[PDB]
Design a protein around this ligand. Structure first.
Ligand SMILES: Nc1ncnc2c1ncn2[C@@H]1O[C@H](COP(=O)(O)OP(=O)(O)OP(=O)(O)O)[C@@H](O)[C@H]1O
Ligand SMILES: N[C@@H](CCC(=O)O)C(=O)O
Ligand SMILES: [Mg+2]
Length: 468
């Protein structure tokens, strides 16, 4: 049975990289009728932010993913937070000492810097301290760390299921710290101990972890454990091919959610980052992704995460995937956040229908259609000048509009058409100023559709205000 996992180290915001990796772990598990678990690697007591773990779990669920074991759902091999299993790492570190696969090192930071400048890294000199002396110094409270005792000289072979076998000269592998001086584990020790105890059979993670694998293979060998299958996914890249980073761009899943990106669209886009459908389709469901999933179609090149492409897909979901009713429901939270209400469901549905071809994110709806839900809408600098330019035309138009009994799109259109001819100007010279007066914008949907949507009286009210 296949068992995959995600092992996020929460820091602040839920990272899009976590969603990307989670997506493929979830797919590989489901495709094989296996299990997908969540382990929180929260031992970094400097980067701990209350609520960060919860935000990650919520984002995974928001994206439509689900997991089988974890901090909140529980499971047969918990605890699922590394902060709750600190004693395990220490006992396993002690086991390595007993096996001769690890040793205590007492160098101060000043000493390590000197050694690094002389040898290019730590040279394992502490391996020459008599074991019994190292234990006594430890018993006496001397500060130290426990390092992996890499076989010197030697070689370590590592197999990545997508890239193949890599033969490392052990001289490329340092005697990495496994247990820190404060008793906390390093990533290498905790990751191997927990993947083993949780029964992980398939490790799928970002390629930046690839070079850490030989260390993990040595640890599995040291404990006498069977190593799982390793799959390293390409890192998400910026247009310039550099690695996407939270310090350089928007990687927060909460930002995407707040910006009005649909979970189904973001999920669909992440699928396209490390995979392509046989037929080439770009729009598909999570179920279809799983059914068609195969490592044979996972590219190893750097996938470019293009925000503009994401917005395009989001827009395609808004007008071609979801129903009008679904969109109207989803824009509600954004309307309320913008301090806007809607007279009725029928009205809202109509507003969404008119704006649907004009917004790519749910957040843009309240921003571009504010004038449809409140009289307190902003008037752009460009719209104001256009209104001013056509004010005299509108003033002469006001009377005709007030007398207009048939307040429909076709009727109003005919009225402006005749008026424009009467004044010797093109229809647009009258339409633009009117649009500005009724919406405070020059970029809106059908002027005539907007003219009649609000009703005659309310429309005249705004024209009056612009003429006041
Ligand atoms: N470009 C990327 N593609 C895929 N996964 C990534 C990428 N960057 C980070 N990750 C993954 O996202 C998670 C969070 O990593 P991290 O908090 O270091 O964010 P970061 O963007 O790498 O920030 P930093 O530049 O400081 O390293 C980790 O699981 C990491 O492997
Ligand atoms: N906690 C590590 C886990 C890496 C792994 O998949 O082994 C990270 O932040 O992704
Ligand atoms: Mg990073």
């Amino acid at each position: 049975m296949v068992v995959t996992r995600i092992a996020p180290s929460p820091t602040g915001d839920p990272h899009v990289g976590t969603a990307y990796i989670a997506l493929f772990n979830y797919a590989w598990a489901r495709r094989n009728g296996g299990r997908f678990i969540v382990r929180i690697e929260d031992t970094d007591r400097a980067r701990y932010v209350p609520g960060a773990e919860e935000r990650i779990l919520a984002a995974l669920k928001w994206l439509g993913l689900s997991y089988d074991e974890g901090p909140d759902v529980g499971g047969p091999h918990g605890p699922y937070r590394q902060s709750e299993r600190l004693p395990l790492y220490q006992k396993y570190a002690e086991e390595l000492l007993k096996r001769g696969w690890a040793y205590r090192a007492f160098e101060t930071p000043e000493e390590l810097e000197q050694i690094r400048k002389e040898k290019g890294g730590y040279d394992g000199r502490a391996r020459n301290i008599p074991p019994e002396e190292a234990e006594e110094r430890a018993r006496r409270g001397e500060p130290h760390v426990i390092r992996l005792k890499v076989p010197r000289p030697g070689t370590t072979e590592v197999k990545d299921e997508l890239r193949g076998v890599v033969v490392y000269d052990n001289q490329e592998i340092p005697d990495v710290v496994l247990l820190k001086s404060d008793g906390y584990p390093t990533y290498h020790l905790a990751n191997v101990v927990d993947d083993h105890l949780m029964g992980v059979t398939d490790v799928i993670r970002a390629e930046e972890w690839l070079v850490s694998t030989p260390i993990h293979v040595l640890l599995y060998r040291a404990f006498g454990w069977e190593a799982p299958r390793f799959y390293h996914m390409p890192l998400l890249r910026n247009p310039d091919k550099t690695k996407i980073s939270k310090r350089k761009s928007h990687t927060s899943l909460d930002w995407y959610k707040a910006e009005g990106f649909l979970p189904e669209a973001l999920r669909n886009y992440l699928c396209l980052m490390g995979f392509s459908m046989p037929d080439g389709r770009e729009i598909f469901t999570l179920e279809e992704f799983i059914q068609a999933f195969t490592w044979e179609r996972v590219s190893l090149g750097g996938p470019v995460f293009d925000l503009e492409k994401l917005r395009w897909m989001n827009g395609k979901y808004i007008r071609e995937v979801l129903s009008l009713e679904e969109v109207a429901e989803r824009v509600k939270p954004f309307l309320r956040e913008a301090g806007l209400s809607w007279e009725s469901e029928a009205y809202l549905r109509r507003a969404v229908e008119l704006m649907r071809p004009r917004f790519d994110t749910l957040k843009e709806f309240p921003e571009k259609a504010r004038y449809l839900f409140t009289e307190d809408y902003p008037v752009s600098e460009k719209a104001q000048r256009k209104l001013e330019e056509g004010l005299p035309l509108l003033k002469e138009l006001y009377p005709r509009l007030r007398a207009q009994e048939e307040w429909t799109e076709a009727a109003l259109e005919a009225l402006l058409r005749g008026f424009a001819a009467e004044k010797g100007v093109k229809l647009g010279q009258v339409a633009q100023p009117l649009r500005a007066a009724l919406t405070g914008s020059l970029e809106t949907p059908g002027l005539f559709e907007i003219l009649a949507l609000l009703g005659k009286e309310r429309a005249l009210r705004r024209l009056e205000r612009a003429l006041a």
